[PDB]
Design a protein around this motif. Structure first.
Motif, mmCIF file in Angstrom:
data_model
loop_
_atom_site.group_PDB
_atom_site.id
_atom_site.type_symbol
_atom_site.label_atom_id
_atom_site.label_comp_id
_atom_site.label_asym_id
_atom_site.label_seq_id
_atom_site.Cartn_x
_atom_site.Cartn_y
_atom_site.Cartn_z
ATOM 1 N N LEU A 165 -24.376 -7.278 -5.937
ATOM 2 C CA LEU A 165 -23.841 -6.235 -5.070
ATOM 3 C C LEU A 165 -22.468 -6.612 -4.523
ATOM 4 O O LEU A 165 -21.605 -5.754 -4.344
ATOM 5 N N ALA A 166 -22.274 -7.901 -4.264
ATOM 6 C CA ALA A 166 -21.000 -8.393 -3.753
ATOM 7 C C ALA A 166 -19.932 -8.367 -4.838
ATOM 8 O O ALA A 166 -18.787 -7.990 -4.588
ATOM 9 N N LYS A 167 -20.315 -8.768 -6.046
ATOM 10 C CA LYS A 167 -19.393 -8.766 -7.173
ATOM 11 C C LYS A 167 -18.988 -7.343 -7.537
ATOM 12 O O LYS A 167 -17.803 -7.045 -7.689
ATOM 13 N N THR A 168 -19.982 -6.470 -7.672
ATOM 14 C CA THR A 168 -19.753 -5.079 -8.050
ATOM 15 C C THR A 168 -18.816 -4.378 -7.071
ATOM 16 O O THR A 168 -17.817 -3.783 -7.476
ATOM 17 N N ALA A 169 -19.137 -4.457 -5.784
ATOM 18 C CA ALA A 169 -18.331 -3.814 -4.753
ATOM 19 C C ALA A 169 -16.904 -4.339 -4.774
ATOM 20 O O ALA A 169 -15.968 -3.652 -4.364
ATOM 21 N N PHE A 170 -16.749 -5.566 -5.255
ATOM 22 C CA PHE A 170 -15.439 -6.182 -5.371
ATOM 23 C C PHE A 170 -14.706 -5.672 -6.608
ATOM 24 O O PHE A 170 -13.578 -5.190 -6.513
ATOM 25 N N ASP A 171 -15.360 -5.774 -7.762
ATOM 26 C CA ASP A 171 -14.782 -5.319 -9.024
ATOM 27 C C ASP A 171 -14.370 -3.855 -8.954
ATOM 28 O O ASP A 171 -13.275 -3.485 -9.378
ATOM 29 N N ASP A 172 -15.258 -3.027 -8.414
ATOM 30 C CA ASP A 172 -15.004 -1.598 -8.299
ATOM 31 C C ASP A 172 -13.820 -1.313 -7.378
ATOM 32 O O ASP A 172 -13.198 -0.256 -7.467
ATOM 33 N N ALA A 173 -13.509 -2.260 -6.498
ATOM 34 C CA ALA A 173 -12.368 -2.115 -5.601
ATOM 35 C C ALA A 173 -11.072 -2.437 -6.336
ATOM 36 O O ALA A 173 -10.061 -1.755 -6.164
ATOM 37 N N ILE A 174 -11.113 -3.482 -7.157
ATOM 38 C CA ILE A 174 -9.974 -3.863 -7.981
ATOM 39 C C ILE A 174 -9.639 -2.761 -8.977
ATOM 40 O O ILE A 174 -8.470 -2.451 -9.204
ATOM 41 N N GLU A 181 -21.347 7.753 -3.244
ATOM 42 C CA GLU A 181 -21.199 9.138 -3.677
ATOM 43 C C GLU A 181 -20.034 9.867 -3.011
ATOM 44 O O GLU A 181 -19.462 10.788 -3.594
ATOM 45 N N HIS A 182 -19.681 9.459 -1.798
ATOM 46 C CA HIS A 182 -18.668 10.184 -1.036
ATOM 47 C C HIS A 182 -17.503 9.313 -0.581
ATOM 48 O O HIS A 182 -16.681 9.748 0.225
ATOM 49 N N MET A 183 -17.419 8.090 -1.094
ATOM 50 C CA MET A 183 -16.367 7.179 -0.652
ATOM 51 C C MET A 183 -15.713 6.430 -1.806
ATOM 52 O O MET A 183 -16.358 6.119 -2.807
ATOM 53 N N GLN A 184 -14.424 6.142 -1.656
ATOM 54 C CA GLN A 184 -13.696 5.351 -2.639
ATOM 55 C C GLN A 184 -14.049 3.874 -2.496
ATOM 56 O O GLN A 184 -14.098 3.352 -1.386
ATOM 57 N N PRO A 185 -14.300 3.197 -3.627
ATOM 58 C CA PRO A 185 -14.666 1.775 -3.647
ATOM 59 C C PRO A 185 -13.684 0.887 -2.885
ATOM 60 O O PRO A 185 -13.986 -0.279 -2.624
ATOM 61 N N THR A 186 -12.524 1.434 -2.540
ATOM 62 C CA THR A 186 -11.533 0.709 -1.759
ATOM 63 C C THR A 186 -11.666 1.055 -0.282
ATOM 64 O O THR A 186 -10.978 0.481 0.562
ATOM 65 N N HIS A 187 -12.549 2.002 0.021
ATOM 66 C CA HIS A 187 -12.806 2.396 1.401
ATOM 67 C C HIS A 187 -13.365 1.211 2.176
ATOM 68 O O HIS A 187 -14.305 0.557 1.728
ATOM 69 N N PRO A 188 -12.776 0.926 3.344
ATOM 70 C CA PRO A 188 -13.187 -0.185 4.207
ATOM 71 C C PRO A 188 -14.648 -0.084 4.640
ATOM 72 O O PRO A 188 -15.359 -1.090 4.633
ATOM 73 N N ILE A 189 -15.086 1.117 5.007
ATOM 74 C CA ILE A 189 -16.456 1.330 5.464
ATOM 75 C C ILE A 189 -17.460 1.029 4.357
ATOM 76 O O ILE A 189 -18.458 0.345 4.584
ATOM 77 N N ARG A 190 -17.190 1.545 3.163
ATOM 78 C CA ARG A 190 -18.054 1.306 2.012
ATOM 79 C C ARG A 190 -18.049 -0.164 1.617
ATOM 80 O O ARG A 190 -19.074 -0.710 1.211
ATOM 81 N N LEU A 191 -16.888 -0.798 1.732
ATOM 82 C CA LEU A 191 -16.768 -2.214 1.415
ATOM 83 C C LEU A 191 -17.558 -3.052 2.411
ATOM 84 O O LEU A 191 -18.286 -3.967 2.026
ATOM 85 N N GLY A 192 -17.413 -2.727 3.693
ATOM 86 C CA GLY A 192 -18.094 -3.452 4.750
ATOM 87 C C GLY A 192 -19.601 -3.383 4.611
ATOM 88 O O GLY A 192 -20.311 -4.328 4.954
ATOM 89 N N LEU A 193 -20.088 -2.255 4.106
ATOM 90 C CA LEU A 193 -21.512 -2.075 3.858
ATOM 91 C C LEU A 193 -21.999 -2.993 2.743
ATOM 92 O O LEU A 193 -23.013 -3.674 2.888
ATOM 93 N N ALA A 194 -21.270 -2.999 1.631
ATOM 94 C CA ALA A 194 -21.616 -3.833 0.487
ATOM 95 C C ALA A 194 -21.682 -5.303 0.880
ATOM 96 O O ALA A 194 -22.489 -6.066 0.350
ATOM 97 N N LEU A 195 -20.822 -5.692 1.817
ATOM 98 C CA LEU A 195 -20.798 -7.059 2.319
ATOM 99 C C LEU A 195 -22.091 -7.394 3.052
ATOM 100 O O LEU A 195 -22.923 -8.144 2.546
ATOM 101 N N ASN A 196 -22.250 -6.823 4.243
ATOM 102 C CA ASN A 196 -23.410 -7.084 5.089
ATOM 103 C C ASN A 196 -24.737 -6.843 4.379
ATOM 104 O O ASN A 196 -25.700 -7.584 4.582
#
Ligand SMILES: *[C@@H]1O[C@H](CO)[C@@H](O)[C@H](O)[C@H]1NC(C)=O
Ligand SMILES: *[C@@H]1O[C@H](CO)[C@@H](O)[C@H](O)[C@H]1NC(C)=O
Lengths: 7, 238, 240, 13
Positions: free
Chosen positions: C195-204, C162-177
């Motif tokens: 969740l891993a695919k989505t967080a990735f696609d949304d970053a691209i 809700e408050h972070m860009q899908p390219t944000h490192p913090i948000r990405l790191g969360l989706a990972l772990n």
């Protein structure tokens, strides 16, 4: 540091 | 009080990379006042070498950072660095004295003249860990341990020359570390290069006197003798 | 000692690879009740990760030996190994309770409602260490920590989305772990892979939103997410 | 035991 050994 | 229980814990600890527990277990074994096997001699050397090796590595990094930020001129920053270096030094000195006590009072002392092998090995360790102390020592304090280390290696060499072939992994190990003592602590590059080559060449001359086991283990050490002779000579020509 | 000398010991201890001392310095910093900077959040997370990480690495070696030697049939050794594994479990558990104390008592607490970035990070961290406990817990104990890990991740997921860009490192790191949590702990590969695919696609998709200050960090996590998806999808074809 | 990749760092600068 030069290489060394202990085994 | 089960011995083979401890030696199991040492191995088990070595696998988990817990060298504080490994050193502890093996110290307890040595305190049983009974001679160590070739495997138990190793488990002890490995354990403590790791415990002190991590301190030496951590010491060199703090010294490096203290050499660089020193010319920076930041008072409060330098102080804590030197204070942290002092912290690690005391941890290092603590481990060396611990091993040296184990050596002087349990191991080296209780070795008859029929166990020349373990005699040299322990004598090498006595020299190795006195050298660790010399690496951080200063003033007349340093001069004391340098002589202590010199006296340990020197005796380890005499017994080696007389009762061990130049192709023995222990004689190769001693000559290796002994030379490093000459180059790094004594700063006598010519005597260090000499001892390194003399040990190496003496291994070549009796090369056919190899056993299938020490055939790989001992040659691994010889290349190490060359690597030093490689790096030592290239520094003099500059 | 000055608060600035503390963080400097943290930097120093990190370089000397003395993470027990690094995690101790950052703990003193945290207890000062001042909000942590971006570097200070990094120093804390790394220090304790290394501390707890070592116990995990050992516990896996020990629990491994406990399965290979259990078939031998020597009850004198199976006991000493099991005894050792419990020693490492206690050490590990001790660290986890320690960080989780710092999180719930100092960090997460003093986070205002406009510090989304910090809160999402501290929560993800909180979920991580509750998952570490779940790796060595069983029965009702394992059930309680897993539930606590879920509650931490789930809340962090909403604040990030809700408050972070899908390219944000913090948000990405969360989706990972978090995805790791599903696959390993929950054992729900579909949820882990999704969740891993989505967080990735949304970053691209919004990849143009990479800021120069931390493009290197964000890009790095993305590889891991794919490397994860690769590794996971290759483990589902073996079981089939 | 088989593990996946993870991360524990925030953007310094
Ligand atoms: C490895 O080399 C270092 C460098 O001086 C030396 O202090 C150490 O004793 C050597 N390792 C062993 C096991 O002797
Ligand atoms: C790294 O991976 C392990 C195992 O997948 C996981 O338990 C751990 O939480 C990860 N690192 C962090 C900082 O979460």
């Amino acid at each position: 540091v030069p290489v060394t050994t202990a085994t | 009080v089960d011995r083979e229980q401890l030696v199991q814990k040492a191995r088990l600890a070595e696998q988990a990379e817990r060298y504080d527990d490994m050193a502890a277990a093996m110290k307890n074994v040595t305190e049983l006042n009974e001679p160590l096997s070739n495997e138990e001699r190793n488990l002890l050397s490995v354990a403590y070498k790791n415990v002190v090796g991590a301190r030496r590595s951590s010491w060199r990094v703090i010294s490096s950072i203290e050499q660089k930020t020193s010319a920076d001129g930041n008072e409060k920053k330098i102080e804590m660095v030197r204070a942290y270096r002092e912290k690690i030094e005391k941890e290092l000195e603590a481990v060396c004295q611990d091993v040296l006590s184990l050596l002087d009072n349990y191991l080296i002392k209780n070795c008859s003249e029929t166990q020349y092998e373990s005699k040299v090995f322990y004598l090498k360790m006595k020299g190795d860990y006195y050298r660790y102390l010399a690496e951080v020592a200063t003033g007349e304090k340093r001069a004391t341990v340098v002589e202590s280390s010199e006296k340990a290696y020197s005796e380890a060499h005499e017994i080696s020359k007389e009762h061990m072939q130049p192709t023995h992994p222990i004689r190769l190990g001693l000559a290796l570390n002994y030379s490093v003592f000459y180059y790094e602590i004594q700063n006598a590059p010519e005597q260090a290069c000499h001892l390194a080559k003399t040990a190496f060449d003496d291994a070549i001359a009796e090369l056919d006197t190899l056993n299938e086991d020490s055939y790989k283990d001992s040659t691994l050490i010889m290349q190490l003798l060359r690597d030093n002779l490689t790096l030592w000579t290239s520094d003099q020509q500059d």
